[PDB]
Every structure is written in C-alpha cells, then in structure tokens.
C-alpha cells in the first residue's frame, strides 16, 4: 500500500503508472530527488487529481509560485500532495483510498507537468 518514487534532474519521475490495490485503506507515496540541484532550481512535488482537473491544478499552481509550493492554496481539486523537494530531500504523503473511485486519475509534479512530469494512478 505504498510506492517509492524518484524525481530527477531531468524532470522525470521513475514511474509513470501507479496501481493502488483495492484492499488498501490508506496509500502512501514516498518521494525523493536524486540529483544535485536545489528546490529553487529543480524542485519536485507529487500531486494527485482527476484527469479532468489536472490542467487547472497545474496552471493555478504554477501561477501561485515557489513560495506556495506551486499549488493554489486550499485547492479542492488536489486529492493528495507532497511538499516541494530539492535534491537529497524526501517527503511522504498518505491519503485515504476511500477518496478514489474504482475514474481517470493523474499524478504529476506541478511545476514540471508541462515538461511531461506526470503519470496515471488507478485503484485496482
Ligand atoms: Cu518537478
């Protein structure tokens, strides 16, 4: 009921598809950042929304800027998210699987989603 994910200096995650087992009550994402760049140059987060909400979350998040971890404050469309991390840092988020429907979900790094830093998540 957990997955470890890396975001690197090339704006790539090392998975682009997450499967959450139907039997999980909670699911945890452990994000880390190989590389040698600080959070204010190449920072990554991990953000989950419906496929339909992704573009708006990214647009509004990018506009909110670095000091808001590139997320619109209190954004109702964000199902779960980590903080923004730089190289050698790590952050984990846990969420209730009850928040998912057996729907199209996307995960992404908000500042680098437009550069392709995204993938799918499905409750299976
Ligand atoms: Cu990123």
Swiss-Prot record:
Gene3D superfamilies: Cupredoxins - blue copper proteins (2.60.40.420). The keyword Transport applies. Cu cation binds at residue 44. Keywords: Copper, Disulfide bond, Electron transport, Metal-binding, Periplasm, Signal, Transport. Pfam families: Copper-bind. Residues 1-124 form the Plastocyanin-like domain. Its main location: periplasm. InterPro entries: Azurin, BlueCu_1, BlueCu_1_BS, Cu-binding_ET, Cupredoxin. One of its GO terms (molecular function) is zinc ion binding. One of its GO terms (cellular component) is plasma membrane. It is found in: Periplasm. Disulfide bonds join 1-24. SUPFAM superfamilies: Cupredoxins. NCBIfam families: azurin. Transfers electrons from cytochrome c551 to cytochrome oxidase. PANTHER family: AURACYANIN-B, OUTER MEMBRANE PROTEIN H.8. This is Azurin. It comes from Pseudomonas aeruginosa (strain ATCC 15692 / DSM 22644 / CIP 104116 / JCM 14847 / LMG 12228 / 1C / PRS 101 / PAO1).
């Amino acid at each position: 009921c957990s997955v470890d994910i890396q975001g690197n200096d090339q704006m790539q995650f090392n998975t682009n598809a997450i499967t959450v087992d139907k039997s999980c009550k909670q699911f945890t994402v452990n994000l880390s950042h190989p590389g040698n760049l600080p959070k204010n140059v190449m920072g990554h987060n991990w953000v989950l929304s419906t496929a339909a909400d992704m573009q708006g979350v990214v647009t509004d998040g990018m506009a909110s800027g670095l000091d808001k971890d590139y997320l619109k404050p209190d954004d109702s469309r964000v199902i779960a998210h980590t903080k923004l991390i730089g190289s050698g840092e790590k952050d984990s988020v846990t969420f209730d699987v009850s928040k998912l429907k057996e729907e199209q979900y996307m995960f992404f790094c908000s500042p680098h989603q437009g550069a392709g830093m995204k993938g799918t998540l499905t409750l299976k």
